RNA sequence: ACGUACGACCAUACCCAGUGGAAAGCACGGCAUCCCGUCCGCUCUGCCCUAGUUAAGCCACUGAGGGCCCGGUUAGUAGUUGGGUCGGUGACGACCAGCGAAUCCCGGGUGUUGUACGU
């Protein structure tokens, strides 16, 4: 049947903004994420933990809980973009890219006994779509 | 059970490579049973190794901090080829 | 130089070969020169030249006539040997090589170079008969060294080894005071010698005694009429020295500089001399073929997450140009519309038929070279943006009126249309339903990968590959499934390419064609029925004859199993 | 990083130990693979292996051997091959300045061959060089012949790393190669590996006892390509 | 998404590299270093950390490949008094001390040919990262304090500054007797209540505290130096391994034999070829 | 027999797709004070084996699966030595020796094994 150890989980939420303009945008990512962003032409920061779902919830609050079908990738990750950062809280356009993992991802990234994750445990597109419909009560069209 | 063996030809030992050329002809029984061939070959090898470490222990040793008694070896005298020749 | 006996026992006696051989063996130079014309006329005829080779005339010429101190007997011997070379095939050239004609040919080249290069008599004050005999000698040297270069690969290497003959070619093409036939033969022999030869290109670009590369570059840059015959030689130099867009040599050594003058040659062609146009089209097709390994040698000398973030974020845009590949810029901007204009000429002349055939060949080469580049998921975007409206122009101007109307011409336009449809990917202008014309061509059609039906299957797969009017995709899918059910009367290459096109068309489930065409027509049942029959026929293919077809059919079977499992899972 | 590699690749006055190379032919019986496995186990520190089944013949053309020796810095090669004419062959090649100096062929008898795994004692530790004893009349010949060449390459195989000081806690293993006297049939060379267990029945010196492990090989020497005197005179010299 | 296009020229790696358990480059570097250029074998001390356990053998390299001299595990420390946290630094030092005592007891430190030599070793860390403060150096410190001689520096010990070469021996002596766990328990007890109960459950129910942990580890070390050959039984020791052999055989999914393979081929012919 | 650690042969062990795994061990997992390292406790390092879960890793089995391997064969052939004898103006072909492949085909296989500690 189903296991509690195969439930979906947000892994990360990378935020990316594309001389002086990068310097100004680095402070915006620093005040939004709370961490120091890194350069590449473009700046980006990686956000994990319980604040990542808060940032993604605010980003879905910008797009009023509606996302297109073409945005959900076939790997399982999904992303979108907002052209103005003012309504989150010079106009800056930034995109939100989010990755989905189950428990047991560490078997692909550890040093000792690195292995491939199984075929029945890999995340698919339709499960991500069902998760999106279930949690935030958003409609995919 | 003696600790030395006397053969008609003297051994030609070369301690630089831990070597002992033996010019005394080995008498192969040439029998169908391989077992007696194995004990004859092992006896010849036993005599060779006995002469080898007897000539090794004849050479002076020195105890060391590494805690291993070391046997000083002469430089190698057997001619051998070379990987790459002498520069300049 | 063994004195073997001559067993003359032919049914037809040598009534005239014996006096010709006696006159050739005579010590008189004028008699030998007079008999050279008769011997050449006899050698031009068939069924009697073999009797002259039974006389061992070639050894008598080689060790006695060509070794004579008088230059006239040497000229007659070289005329005899060049006539015998022109009449007979390359095994004669191998026979000359095994008698060491290369040492004598280099000695004669050095002697004639010493007589022509000297300014002490000088060469200019000589009589017209003497200089005419000298130029006839050099013509014999050039035609013989060209045929020996065309004989075999090791003979080509041995000719490229000798420096004196290359110096003679450099002095001949740099002095340019010879008559036009000798200069043209020197150009042709440098063309044949420069193909895939590092040594010839190095000697061309490294000469400072005459600076031959400077003269060739100056000629190729200008509007000199014969200069286009030189240009491909430089192209062969740029084929040999790896002087291309990724790493140019002296003065930005790329083929793009060679482009416009040849294009200017295309400006010299008018609707309603032809060797110049044919050589220009051959050189352009050569550039178009060589641009493929130019690309792979350019490429020879995390990211997936970034590509997914770019694709999913809907941030796709078009910018930039082909600044890193200027040869492609000069080909697309100038050469492609000129070949389009040249292809659509009136067909009132057979010369125009040959010109149109070579133009379609050049367009086929450049279109296949461009279309083999991967444009999936927006990679190499600027090249696609440059090529796309010109590719639609090629489809509108060339493919449709030719297809409105020869098996060879149909094969060429099918290959060109496949090359265009591989990069258009369903954005082809559907005017007058060209896929129905392709279906009619394939039905009228009735080593294995170059058939007409294979290219017809390939083009009708690509036209509906991506979103395009559902009815075109419906007709293509019905045709492909009808081909797959009746697999008894088709070659396996057609089956392999039809399966590959069926994988590429109906792959993902996001498209409307998967819901509207694939599941409504029940193609999965036909594929599941087809799987054991295609397993039997791919077990029927021998491996030692066509290993490529066997490997591609095994790949087709594995991908068919994966595809039917995918469509069973995704419903 | 490549500076130390170039320094190791450079010729040096005091020679480093030679890196052997084991490579396999197109056809190879299981006996020849087991023999190369045993020899590679006994030369485990200074060796390299190729699992790519290279299609070369060492006696006809030696260009591929020169290419492999310049690419991998290998001055000693063991090539295993199998034919209907010659059932199990191991050819030993010594090369000098990336050109072939000496080659020899050993024909192995498959009926009397025993691997290391079939003896069940304590084995030799990795990298400890064994003592050598060469008992036989055939090794002492005035003219340079086959058995002197076999001695001159089995010494180079089993020498390992030279040292002028050797602790007594080694010296526990002997490699015994023996050749019959040159009499019809060609003489048979024999390679045995033995371990030394000391029993002190004598008052002063210990008495050896011999226990067998390792390969049990019966070679017959075959084809040969002797070195040229020009390479021999210049590579036999001493610094 | 499709077109698996292939690869008979693809050559696999070794068995213990596809599983990712051994790096053969570091293994070759370790066995070459150990030779000493004298022809003397050197024993290398391996240490591997699982979750819940510490595995410490002391291996030597052979042709068949390896011979365990003496193996010390973290399980039998439950026989010496310590029962909670058998993975931390203090258990690592205890396992190193137990391993050194075991290898020095079974060495004895009838016709030997050597005609009081302390023991020698080489540290093996495996695929574990060799950062400072890592418990591989705890096992190494336990071995080097137990009586064997390991060539080592104080660079990788914890409580060691990096911009000056001073080792705070108070911090090291705190980690030997598990003082970091003690002060962590004190901090979690004072400034928290949920985590100090969520963790340290077996510490709570067995009624141990900071100074009790320190004296208990000291008594454990004295017990290790007293009699290092105890035995432990934990859960369910059904002995007489033939019983375990029968139990494993009657839960093993057996294969199909050659007659059964012929029967399966006949069934496949009747089901697919003959439908 | 099964499990771990360390290994030896290094695809019979890999690749894809299905079904199952008692005991213990492996894992997954929990936490971020200290040692330590990051854009991010993701990896690395430290603390807890309590709560969970065999979903994946791992192991086992299945598949007219792809691949791979062993034995017999294809061959002392092709090819090569233009190395030697006869033809052939030649190109080259017969002939005699030495060296000497591979697919196809037929039969079988899908891991053996060492030390230590356990269930």
Author numbering:
A (entry chain B): 6 to 23, 28 to 49, 66 to 114, 122 to 173
B (entry chain D): 11 to 98
C (entry chain F): 20 to 291, 301 to 329, 388 to 491, 495 to 535, 550 to 674
D (entry chain C): 11 to 193, 220 to 275
E (entry chain A): 2 to 7, 13 to 115, 133 to 138, 142 to 301
Task: Quote the authors verbatim.
We reconstituted the assembly-competent 5S RNP, which is a conserved hexameric complex, composed of Syo1, Rpf2, Rrs1, uL18, uL5 and 5S rRNA, and solved its structure by cryo-electron microscopy (cryo-EM). To gain insight into the architecture of the conserved 5S RNP hexamer precursor, we focused on the 5S RNP isolated from C. thermophilum under normal growth conditions. The cryo-EM structure of this complex was solved at an average resolution of 3.5 Å, which allowed us to build a near-complete molecular model. The overall architectures of the C. thermophilum hexameric 5S RNP and the related ct–sc chimera are highly similar; both are hexameric complexes, in which the protein factors Syo1, uL18, uL5, Rpf2 and Rrs1 are positioned around the prominent and typically structured 5S rRNA. Only the Rpf2–Rrs1 C-terminal extensions are not visible at normal contour levels, suggesting that they are exposed and flexible. The overall architecture of the 5S hexameric particle adopted to a large extent the conformation of the 5S RNP as observed in the context of the pre-60S assembly intermediate. The cryo-EM structure of the 5S RNP hexamer shows direct contacts between Syo1 and the 5S rRNA: two contacts ‘A’ and ‘B’ in the Syo1 N terminus that touch the 5S rRNA at loop D in helix IV, and another contact ‘C’ between a Syo1 C-terminal helix (residues 650–671) and the 5S rRNA middle region. Consistent with this relocation, the Syo1 internal concave surface is unoccupied in the ct–sc chimera 5S RNP hexamer, but an extra density persists at this site in the C. thermophilum 5S RNP hexamer. Whether this density is an additional uL18-N peptide of unknown origin, or is derived from another factor (for example, part of the flexible Syo1 loop), remains unclear. Thus, in this cascade, Syo1 initially acts principally as an import adaptor for uL18–uL5, but after 5S RNP assembly, it continues to perform a chaperone role not only to shield the uL5 groove from unwanted interactions, but also to stabilize the 5S rRNA prior to incorporation into the pre-ribosome.
The 5S ribonucleoprotein (RNP) is assembled from its three components (5S rRNA, Rpl5/uL18 and Rpl11/uL5) before being incorporated into the pre-60S subunit. The 5S rRNA is separately transcribed by RNA polymerase III and, after joining with its cognate ribosomal proteins uL18 and uL5 (previously called Rpl5 and Rpl11, respectively), forms the minimal trimeric 5S RNP core complex, which is eventually incorporated into the pre-60S particle. However, when ribosome synthesis is disturbed, a free 5S RNP can enter the MDM2–p53 pathway to regulate cell cycle and apoptotic signaling. Here we reconstitute and determine the cryo-electron microscopy structure of the conserved hexameric 5S RNP with fungal or human factors.
